[PDB]
């Protein structure tokens, strides 16, 4: 199964990805995680992406497309994958469509996780993330068992720099401008499914799982 998670900042993509890969055991491919690993590794590409990410701006398409192309060509992506936060732009969706054709593959579903703006801001304001594994929590909506500690591994929780309200505003601005072009691209392709992301975590997954389980 070849799946795309799309959604505005805060919509619950990573949270749902954790649920999906637990049940289905396809690899989780996140462009955000790939950029963060390039940053940890200190590469030229990583260092160049960092300024965009800190500002809540999209990394330019050319770089992003090249890293996804390389990742998805690996042997572990040939029996299914979960793409999370790619494509974010019609140019990226165009390129992925070519890339997939060259691999003899196509998308099963693009899951558009829908959430109201106010809720998106409430979610990003209360978010804490494990520095080790990247699991995400929310002070109100999904707290860790003990404050400041990841439930899975005992890791330290941190606040992402781009979660500051002024940066969140820029992220929603920049990403909303891309939503309707992306929806139009995939509505045509017959793969788009809207998911009500504004429910309890496990109940959003009920809806996603209904789709995935039928594949």
Selected from 4, 130, 171, 182, the binder of ligand AP5 by CB under 6 A is: 171
58 lines the binding site for ligand AP5 (CB under 6 A): yes
24 lines the binding site for ligand AP5 (CB under 6 A): no
Q: Which is nearer to Zn ion, 6 or 130 (CB)?
A: 130
Selected from 38, 123, 157, 195, the binder of ligand AP5 by CB under 6 A is: 123
User: Helix or strand or coil: residue 200?
Assistant: coil
- Residue corresponding to tokens 């017959």: 190
Q: Pick the stretch among 24-32, 35-43, 76-84, 149-157 that binds Zn ion (CB under 5 A).
A: 149-157
Alpha-helical segments (H) within 104-164: 117-125
- 71 labelled catalytic: no
Range 87-122 burial, b when 16+ CB lie within 10 A, else e:
bbbebbbebbbebeeeeeeebbbbbbbebeeeebbb
Q: What does 109 interact with, of Zn ion, ligand AP5, none (CB < 5 to 8 A by kind)?
A: none
Q: What does 135 interact with, of Zn ion, ligand AP5, none (CB < 5 to 8 A by kind)?
A: Zn ion
71 lines the binding site for ligand AP5 (CB under 6 A): no
Quote the tokens at residue 174: 């920049």
User: Helix or strand or coil: residue 113?
Assistant: strand
77 marked as binding residue: no
Selected from 12, 83, 186, 212, the binder of ligand AP5 by CB under 6 A is: 12
Active-site residue identified among 48, 105, 160, 164: 160
Q: Which is nearer to ligand AP5, 157 or 212 (CB)?
A: 157
Which residues are part of the catalytic machinery?
13, 88, 127, 160, 171
- The residues that touch ligand AP5, with contacts defined as CB under 6 A, are 7, 9-15, 30-32, 35, 52-53, 56-59, 64, 85-86, 88, 92, 123, 126-127, 136-138, 141-142, 171, 199, 201, 204
């Amino acid at each position: 199964m070849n799946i795309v998670l799309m959604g505005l900042p805060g919509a619950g993509k990573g949270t749902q990805a954790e649920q999906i890969i637990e049940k289905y055991e396809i690899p989780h491919i996140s462009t955000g995680d790939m950029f963060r690993a390039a940053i940890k590794n200190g590469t030229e590409l990583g260092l160049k992406a960092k300024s965009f990410m800190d500002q809540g701006n999209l990394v330019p398409d050319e770089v992003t497309i090249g890293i996804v192309h390389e990742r998805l060509s690996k042997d572990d992506c040939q029996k299914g994958f979960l793409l999370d936060g790619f494509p974010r732009t019609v140019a990226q969706a165009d390129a992925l469509d070519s890339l997939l054709t060259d691999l003899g593959k196509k998308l099963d579903y693009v899951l558009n996780i829908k959430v109201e703006q106010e809720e998106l801001m409430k979610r990003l304001t209360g978010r804490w993330i494990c520095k080790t594994c990247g699991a995400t929590y929310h002070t109100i909506f999904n707290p860790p068992a003990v404050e400041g500690i990841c439930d899975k591994d005992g890791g330290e929780l941190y606040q992402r720099i781009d979660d500051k309200p002024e940066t969140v505003k820029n992220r929603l601005d920049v990403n909303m401008k891309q939503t309707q072009p992306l929806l139009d691209f995939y509505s045509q392709k017959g793969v788009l499914k809207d998911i009500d992301g504004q429910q309890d975590i496990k109940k959003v997954f009920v809806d996603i799982n209904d789709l995935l389980g039928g594949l």
